Design a protein around this ligand. Sequence first.
Ligand SMILES: [Zn+2]
Ligand SMILES: [Zn+2]
Lengths: 66, 148, 115, 254
Amino acid sequence: MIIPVRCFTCGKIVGNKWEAYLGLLQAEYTEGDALDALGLKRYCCRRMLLAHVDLIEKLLNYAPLE
Amino acid sequence: AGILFEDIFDVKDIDPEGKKFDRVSRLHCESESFKMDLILDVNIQIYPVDLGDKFRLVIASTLYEDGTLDDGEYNPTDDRPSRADQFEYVMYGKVYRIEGDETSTEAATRLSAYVSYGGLLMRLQGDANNLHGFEVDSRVYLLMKKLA
Amino acid sequence: MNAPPAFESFLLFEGEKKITINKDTKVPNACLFTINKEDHTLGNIIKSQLLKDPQVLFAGYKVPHPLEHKIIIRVQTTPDYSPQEAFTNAITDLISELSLLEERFRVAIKDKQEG
Amino acid sequence: PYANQPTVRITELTDENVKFIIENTDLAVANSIRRVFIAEVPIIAIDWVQIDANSSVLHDEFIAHRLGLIPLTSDDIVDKLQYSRDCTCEEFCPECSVEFTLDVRCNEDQTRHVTSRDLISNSPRVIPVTSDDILIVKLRKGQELRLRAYAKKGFGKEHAKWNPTAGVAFEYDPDNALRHTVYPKPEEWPKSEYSELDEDESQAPYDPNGKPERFYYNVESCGSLRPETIVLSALSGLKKKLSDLQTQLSHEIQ
Ligand SMILES: [Zn+2]
Ligand SMILES: [Zn+2]
């Protein structure tokens, strides 16, 4: 739905890296290089940014009921 | 004394049927004096023995060298002088079988005594005269010391 | 629904004793310490320190059930040294060890920061 | 019959992790210290989220759960703070909690990112550690999120939001000298970073007289506490637990 705050396994903060991850990918980085640049060494943390599907961007297409 | 048996053996084979337990080896040993055949499972990991070694073996009823019964219970705080201090490897088991070449007519000349040190099995074959101390379902201590 | 509250794994409720001693009648000089609202954190460390004592003939611990919060520590000792005395001495040894470790860790932090 | 004399050696100390080695200690003390790093170091984390208005796409419990997981700077305040359950108040006074206020209205057409920057504390010592900032929720034009929340002292045993560590690496016997693990093919296994063997061995020779010692640690902080503060608070808390147990035992014996 949205990027989780913590890494599920180890508890490292990941929610403050989704926009930076996408920005690095727009800079023509391999996904491994992007995750290494963000400093995610344990594959538990890397799994979360590598496999996250951001549906909130799609949910924001619908107008709010206010 | 309480020493049911004593001898010096030499290892003539280490693990004859191929290795089957990564920490235990089935030594086959001969005795030069009593000419007893010995099979004995030894935890080689803590007491490594290789082929052609020699060692004094002693099967004893007790360890306190006074005839005082052991009670068959683990007492780490023992002030009595233990016979085990004169030996490198000490195991504690129960003799569970005494076979022989006896017929219904005559007694046995050759006896084979089997002991189980917690699972580590030993057989001691030889003439009956040296195995009269062994009796089934009695506790024994195997005391083994390498000889130079 | 039936999920227990998260706080009732370290909190004693009303009229619950933190630690209870019961002599073991099967063996002389043996006691069972049932400590409530504890886990392997204290069980394993206290067991290890008790094993370091030379007068302790037996020291073991178990959690009876993981969903419940108790540790039963069985301590058997030589006839001239009570299990309660051994338990107290083990805890004082652990406290001294951790105080020394705090001091040395502080010294190491100061050295690494200065360095 | 008495305590070991443990010796510390700090190998690396950054602002996000501390690496150190403890020698002359039994395995149980080291394991309990790691356990106390994970589950018994108190920090300050958000609890009691009261939502006044939430027209975002994420439902209320989702937002509250995300707020709980935000780490808060609790380096020096948490020790003098009290557990709310023990305090004598309406459960929220400055001596047992820290108020937070979020009030975000998305008026521009562009997607508004509700980050941890938008969490306003009433105490300057306690802020989100990122203040990139942790995204809480994205808002559309006309959507609003407005709430107030507090932050209580708790530790990781109660809930994982209070866990201060982002993964505690722990190791001992890097060459497998004690053979506490038995490799079927030891050649296939990579050397640990603390290994001291050459590139022709796979394991150290077996040591029957060996005992575990020289435990290697690497405590990575999520951010709410400095790693050295995590270790010091951990040792203090374990000592406090043992002293309280001694007090209760002395009362029981008496
Ligand atoms: Zn992770
Ligand atoms: Zn209060």
